[PDB]
Amino acid sequence: AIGELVRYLNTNPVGGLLEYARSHGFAAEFKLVDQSGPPHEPKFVYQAKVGGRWFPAVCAHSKKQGKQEAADAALRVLIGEN
Amino acid sequence: SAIGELVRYLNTNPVGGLLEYARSHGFAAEFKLVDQSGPPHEPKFVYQAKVGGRWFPAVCAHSKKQGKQEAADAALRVLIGENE
């Protein structure tokens, strides 16, 4: 359980968080909280929601990185709780 | 928690509501600045509430006062969703 959470924390945290959700029968989702900036310097704020619970919101410079940064924050919260 | 718990604070005093919730669990209610953007005369702020080891939905606002209010309201609505 904890081992499965640590496994993909670095290489693919979205994948690790999605598998945690799948193992418990609920969803992991990545809320796009905000988009700012001009095309040459876009900024996104993302936050994970897993099974009705919300996790630290994070910033990033792409949607793809934003989702991974949000998943990383969520996994670290979950690793600590377990 | 029972139907109606915390509903009193919605749209009247959401920050004070979250402060009361936090005290009932022995924690401070925290409002975290997540991001700031825009030019100095038209800022945008993203805030989210935190109570102990629990996090709540992040929200966007044009001022710190409005961001905290909205973050508190979003947090209360998550908590009210636990009522049954």
UniProtKB/Swiss-Prot annotation, chain B:
Residues 3-12 are annotated as: N-terminal extension of DRBM 3 and constituent of a bi-partite nuclear localization signal. Changing residue 11 to A: No effect on nuclear location. Induction: Isoform 1 is induced by interferon alpha. Isoform 5 is constitutively expressed. Ubiquitously expressed, highest levels were found in brain and lung. Isoform 5 is expressed at higher levels in astrocytomas as compared to normal brain tissue and expression increases strikingly with the severity of the tumor, being higher in the most aggressive tumors. Sumoylation reduces RNA-editing activity. Residues 13-81 form the DRBM domain. Catalyzes the hydrolytic deamination of adenosine to inosine in double-stranded RNA (dsRNA) referred to as A-to-I RNA editing. It is linked to Dyschromatosis symmetrica hereditaria: An autosomal dominant pigmentary genodermatosis characterized by a mixture of hyperpigmented and hypopigmented macules distributed on the face and the dorsal parts of the hands and feet, that appear in infancy or early childhood. Aicardi-Goutieres syndrome 6: A form of Aicardi-Goutieres syndrome, a genetically heterogeneous disease characterized by cerebral atrophy, leukoencephalopathy, intracranial calcifications, chronic cerebrospinal fluid (CSF) lymphocytosis, increased CSF alpha-interferon, and negative serologic investigations for common prenatal infection. Clinical features as thrombocytopenia, hepatosplenomegaly and elevated hepatic transaminases along with intermittent fever may erroneously suggest an infective process. This is Double-stranded RNA-specific adenosine deaminase. The gene is ADAR. The chain holds residues 716 to 797 of 1226 of the full protein.
